[PDB]
DNA sequence: CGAACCTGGTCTTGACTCCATTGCCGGATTTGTATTAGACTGGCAGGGTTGCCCCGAAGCGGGCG
């Protein structure tokens, strides 16, 4: 149904005084990774650092 | 009245000496930074009370047809 959808949409778009709730809503966007993605990203980091050292 | 003296601050000099002032050096202690490789991935005061001000339905009366 869409009644629970509009209920969750109305309850999710509520403003409060807690900044930590906004921070958790902020950090809840990007999903977690796996070890091969971590290896690939660290490869990219070290390669970019060697490239800017070459620069 | 003239001479010798006693004692007043007054002041120099030679010697002693004593304690602050750096100063170095060695060590003790004290404070500041870097590092720990299994994996671990989204919380909690909190409401309740009292009083006053700002926007929305609603009669509703006047303009409209």
Short mmCIF file of C-alpha atoms (C1' of nucleotides) in Angstrom, two decimals:
data_model
loop_
_atom_site.label_atom_id
_atom_site.label_comp_id
_atom_site.label_asym_id
_atom_site.label_seq_id
_atom_site.Cartn_x
_atom_site.Cartn_y
_atom_site.Cartn_z
CA UNK A 1 0.00 0.00 0.00
CA UNK A 2 0.90 3.70 -0.15
CA UNK A 3 -0.75 4.76 3.13
CA UNK A 4 2.26 3.52 5.10
CA UNK A 5 4.40 5.17 2.40
CA UNK A 6 2.85 8.61 2.88
CA UNK A 7 2.90 8.09 6.66
CA UNK A 8 6.64 7.31 6.60
CA UNK A 9 7.22 10.21 4.20
CA UNK A 10 5.39 12.65 6.48
CA UNK A 11 7.14 11.31 9.59
CA UNK A 12 10.56 11.30 7.90
CA UNK A 13 10.17 14.95 6.89
CA UNK A 14 9.91 16.24 10.44
CA UNK A 15 12.19 18.88 11.95
CA UNK A 16 13.31 18.63 15.57
CA UNK A 17 15.89 20.29 17.81
CA UNK A 18 18.39 17.41 17.94
CA UNK A 19 21.34 18.05 15.64
CA UNK A 20 22.47 14.44 16.05
CA UNK A 21 19.29 13.19 14.36
CA UNK A 22 20.12 15.38 11.37
CA UNK A 23 23.69 14.08 11.43
CA UNK A 24 22.53 10.45 11.45
CA UNK A 25 20.10 11.21 8.63
CA UNK A 26 23.05 12.78 6.80
CA UNK A 27 25.41 9.83 7.25
CA UNK A 28 22.73 7.25 6.44
CA UNK A 29 23.04 7.83 2.69
CA UNK A 30 26.23 6.13 1.50
CA UNK A 31 26.26 2.35 1.73
CA UNK A 32 29.03 0.20 3.16
CA UNK A 33 31.69 -1.49 1.04
CA UNK A 34 33.52 -4.80 0.76
CA UNK A 35 37.20 -5.64 1.03
CA UNK A 36 37.90 -5.67 -2.71
CA UNK A 37 36.40 -2.19 -3.01
CA UNK A 38 38.54 -1.09 -0.06
CA UNK A 39 41.62 -2.48 -1.82
CA UNK A 40 40.65 -0.73 -5.07
CA UNK A 41 40.04 2.60 -3.31
CA UNK A 42 43.33 2.39 -1.41
CA UNK A 43 45.06 1.61 -4.71
CA UNK A 44 43.44 4.75 -6.14
CA UNK A 45 44.57 6.78 -3.12
CA UNK A 46 48.20 5.68 -3.30
CA UNK A 47 48.23 6.06 -7.09
CA UNK A 48 46.87 9.60 -6.81
CA UNK A 49 49.49 10.44 -4.20
CA UNK A 50 52.27 9.07 -6.40
CA UNK A 51 50.83 11.00 -9.35
CA UNK A 52 50.77 14.25 -7.41
CA UNK A 53 54.30 13.50 -6.19
CA UNK A 54 55.30 13.09 -9.83
CA UNK A 55 53.61 16.45 -10.37
"C1'" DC B 1 95.51 85.63 79.46
"C1'" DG B 2 98.55 81.44 77.36
"C1'" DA B 3 99.33 76.31 77.04
"C1'" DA B 4 97.77 71.19 77.48
"C1'" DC B 5 94.03 68.18 77.14
"C1'" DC B 6 89.09 65.71 76.25
"C1'" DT B 7 86.08 64.86 73.47
"C1'" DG B 8 82.74 66.46 69.71
"C1'" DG B 9 81.47 65.08 64.84
"C1'" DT B 10 84.35 64.29 60.46
"C1'" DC B 11 86.55 61.86 57.28
"C1'" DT B 12 90.35 58.27 54.80
"C1'" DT B 13 92.34 54.05 54.22
"C1'" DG B 14 93.58 49.26 54.61
"C1'" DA B 15 91.96 44.89 55.33
"C1'" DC B 16 88.26 41.40 55.67
"C1'" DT B 17 84.51 39.15 54.18
"C1'" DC B 18 80.19 37.79 52.62
"C1'" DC B 19 76.61 36.97 49.83
"C1'" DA B 20 74.16 37.72 45.29
"C1'" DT B 21 74.81 36.65 40.12
"C1'" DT B 22 75.65 34.08 36.53
"C1'" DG B 23 76.99 29.76 34.65
"C1'" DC B 24 77.75 25.04 33.47
"C1'" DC B 25 76.74 20.32 33.84
"C1'" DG B 26 74.71 16.21 35.01
"C1'" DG B 27 70.77 14.11 36.20
"C1'" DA B 28 65.49 13.66 37.33
"C1'" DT B 29 60.90 14.60 36.29
"C1'" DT B 30 57.53 16.10 33.43
"C1'" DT B 31 54.94 16.94 29.37
"C1'" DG B 32 53.85 16.08 24.47
"C1'" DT B 33 53.42 12.95 20.10
"C1'" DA B 34 53.34 8.46 17.45
"C1'" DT B 35 51.90 3.63 17.46
"C1'" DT B 36 49.41 -0.71 18.57
"C1'" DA B 37 46.62 -5.42 11.64
"C1'" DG B 38 40.88 -10.89 13.26
"C1'" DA B 39 36.07 -8.36 12.89
"C1'" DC B 40 33.27 -5.17 14.90
"C1'" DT B 41 29.67 0.15 10.70
"C1'" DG B 42 23.10 4.97 12.19
"C1'" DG B 43 21.08 7.36 20.41
"C1'" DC B 44 19.08 9.17 23.08
"C1'" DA B 45 15.66 14.18 29.39
"C1'" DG B 46 11.32 15.17 28.43
"C1'" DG B 47 7.52 16.43 29.89
"C1'" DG B 48 4.32 19.38 31.75
"C1'" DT B 49 1.98 24.06 32.83
"C1'" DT B 50 0.34 28.67 31.66
"C1'" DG B 51 -0.45 32.35 29.00
"C1'" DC B 52 -0.65 34.98 24.66
"C1'" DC B 53 -0.36 35.78 19.62
"C1'" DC B 54 -1.07 34.40 14.48
"C1'" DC B 55 -3.54 32.02 10.68
"C1'" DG B 56 -7.92 29.35 8.83
"C1'" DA B 57 -13.08 28.14 8.34
"C1'" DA B 58 -17.21 30.64 8.16
"C1'" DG B 59 -21.19 33.67 8.24
"C1'" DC B 60 -22.26 37.10 5.55
"C1'" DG B 61 -23.30 41.20 3.40
"C1'" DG B 62 -22.37 43.65 -0.52
"C1'" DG B 63 -21.07 43.48 -5.33
"C1'" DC B 64 -22.41 40.65 -9.34
"C1'" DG B 65 -25.45 38.37 -12.89
#
